[PDB]
Every structure is written in C-alpha cells, then in structure tokens.
Write a protein that binds this ligand. Sequence first.
Ligand SMILES: *[C@@H]1O[C@H](CO)[C@@H](O)[C@H](O)[C@H]1NC(C)=O
Ligand SMILES: [Zn+2]
Ligand SMILES: [Zn+2]
Length: 440
Amino acid sequence: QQVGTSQAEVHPSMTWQSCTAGGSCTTNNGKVVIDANWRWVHKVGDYTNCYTGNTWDTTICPDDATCASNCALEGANYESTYGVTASGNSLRLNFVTTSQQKNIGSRLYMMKDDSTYEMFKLLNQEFTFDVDVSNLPCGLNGALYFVAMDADGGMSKYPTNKAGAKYGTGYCDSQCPRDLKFINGQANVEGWQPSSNDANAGTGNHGSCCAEMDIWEANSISTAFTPHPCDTPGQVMCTGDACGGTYSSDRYGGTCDPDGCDFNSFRQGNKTFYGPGMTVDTKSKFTVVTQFITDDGTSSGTLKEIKRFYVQNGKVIPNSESTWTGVSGNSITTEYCTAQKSLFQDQNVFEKHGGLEGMGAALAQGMVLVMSLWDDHSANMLWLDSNYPTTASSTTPGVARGTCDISSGVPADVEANHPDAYVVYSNIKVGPIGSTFNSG
Ligand SMILES: *[C@@H]1O[C@H](CO)[C@@H](O)[C@H](O)[C@H]1NC(C)=O
Ligand SMILES: [Zn+2]
Ligand SMILES: [Zn+2]
C-alpha cells in the first residue's frame, strides 16, 4: 500500500526501560503505532475508500496487486478516533470510541524510531510490566504479546509496500490471520468474504503466519500466558484453508500452532489465584514478570522454561501450582506441555511445530511487542474466561478457564454494554533474569 497524506502520522511517545544485572535501568524513548487494518484506506489522490464496512471497492481493487498500487493508508488520530492515549511510560487503550464513526479496539506496536519496530530479544531475559485490568469485563481481552514481524513492516522486502512500520504494516501471528487487508505489499481483496458477525471485518485468500509468544491475554476474571511455535518462526504468507488457524476451516492443518502451550491458573486447577479479591487482585494494578530460561543460561541456549511471577502491594507472588494429577509445576516446560495436552485431550500440535525449542527459534529472530484490546467474534473469549467448549462439563479437566457465564462475550453485547472498558499498560522493563523485580 501507498502512503496517504490527508492526515499526518505522529506516533504517541511511550518510554520503556532496559535493565542490567544488579537492577540499574536506562530509559528508552519508544513510540507506538496503530496497526494498518484500523486505518482509513483510500484511492491515491482521492478520498474514495478502497474498503468500507466489510467489503472492498472492486473497481479500485480488481486484484491484489492493482489494489496495492491504487490504495493509500492514512495517518491516525490516536486519541479522538481510536481511544489511544499515552503518557510517560503508560499506554491506555479504550474499547469503543465514537467520532464520525464507531471504532472498536486497537492493536499497537512498540517502535524504536518512526520507521522501525523495536526488535526484542527475550532469550535469557525477562519482560516485566504493570497492568490495570480492573475495567476489563468478561468477553474482552487486553493482550500484550510478541510476534515475529519484520522490523520495517516488510518495506525492504516488498517494494509495493511504501508505508511500512510507520503505518503499522506487516502483522502476522500464529492464527495465520486472513482478516488483514494488506499482506506482503498485496491487498487481500481476492477471495474476500465479509464476516457474518463483524460489520468491519472479513477474510481473504491470503493469511500472514508467524510465531507468537502470548505474554498476557487477560481481563479482570482470567489470564493466560502461551507460546505458539510455527514451522517457520518469521512472517510467511499462506493461501486458503491451508493457512490453518481460527480463520480457516481446519484449525490444525497449517504450519503454526493455533492453541499454544498455555498456563491459565484457573484452567490449571486454582480457582482463587487470579481475579477480583484474589491472590493476584484484579481490582488493582499489579506487575507481571515473565522469564525465558534457556538450557545453558545464555542468550544462545535453547528455551527450556517460561516462568511467571507477579508483584502486587510490594509482595512477590510466584505463579500458582497446577493441581491436576499428573500435571504439576507452576511454569511452562516441555514435560508440562506433554502432560497437559494429554490430560485435557487436546491435539498436541505444539510439539509438532517445534515446541519450546521452536518458540525459542522465533525469540532468537527478535520480536515485535504488541499491545491490544479486542473482543472475540469467533468464540466470545470463552476459551479465556468461561467453559470451553461450552458443551463440555465443567468438571472435566481443561474445560473451565474462568467464572464467566457461557453466554457472555457476544460481541454485539460486549460493544453495547462496555464501550467504556479500557486497559492500561505501563512501566515496561526488560533485562537479565532477576533484574527487573525483587528476585528471584
Ligand atoms: C492457589 O494458589 C495460592 C497461591 O499459590 C495457594 O496459596 C492456594 O492454596 C492455591 N489453591 C489451590 C487449590 O491449590
Ligand atoms: Zn472524491
Ligand atoms: Zn467486536
């Protein structure tokens, strides 16, 4: 896609810190950028939309290549259009924002400069941040995660992408999403079908696959952390139902793990660890620490464990024990993942696509930091905070993931009832293991 000039693009500033062993930290002058799919996209030299609602203008966009030549991405009004504000080290995302139109959610990337994403290298490090999830109900997800995107959003690779990381291009994840309008400097107009329950979304013939480390998928009820390996760690375009993932008919038939190896304390058998009034109390802000432990204690070792700590009211809180017979420990390891998928009777494509070693291979490439807020038009967020699948018995291991009602989270309802919902991410720190909090 091309660059529109009607609205200048100015990235809100957000600082984060780099820490050294011993706990000293240096402040980095980061900036954030909204993902290209949220943007106005119009004919070059005109105001005519290339895409409106959930359908393309097939005169401007008769095929994927012509569409990319003829269609320009615009700059964003972060606060007024998108409900996005930042100050100091804090980023706030609001759910619904009404201007001339009604915007729902957002997805932001951390930038190193105005044309380059910050490439985090997490092996043998910890990532730590503070969050306020107190205004997130059932059905919403404030996600903070990492994906193996290209640092320039694909500009050097794809000359027909003139916009790049400045306009939030190049997204990919472990669902191999087919709902993206531009992938690899081509539109996705070919094969495009509108969503049956999302007035703003649809899916095309192309998807964008890469490995994904879900540090944080959460609301006030439940949270989960989840590595998703792929056969290739970096961005790849896929075609058709062969993509696999949530957007295709056979979830498990592609090159990425769409389920991941998850640790949700509630799902792992402790109903009183995370939530309102719980050990980790969602009514207030708390710190989330995530460690990526390697086999040899260096950044070139193989990923072997993912550990989680929380800090709240100055108390360091280790992750809760998994309580199911045969599925113990409080971290993600290969042995956990094998044992968990077996007990829960889930298909283990985690191992098939490389397990933790494959996730570590993605981490070694460098990864982009994503902060988002969304509702779930495929599964109503029930997989995070309710029984899933909703037909199953809540006494079966793996079924119950939080206390939300099985009828919660319908997007029409979520959009109507919680337009005011918001999340606040702040105080990001990255450094050697133990360096970012009162360890260990
Ligand atoms: C839940 O986790 C907390 C903190 O680790 C612990 O004190 C409590 O006993 C746990 N509950 C169960 C059922 O294991
Ligand atoms: Zn016009
Ligand atoms: Zn929605």
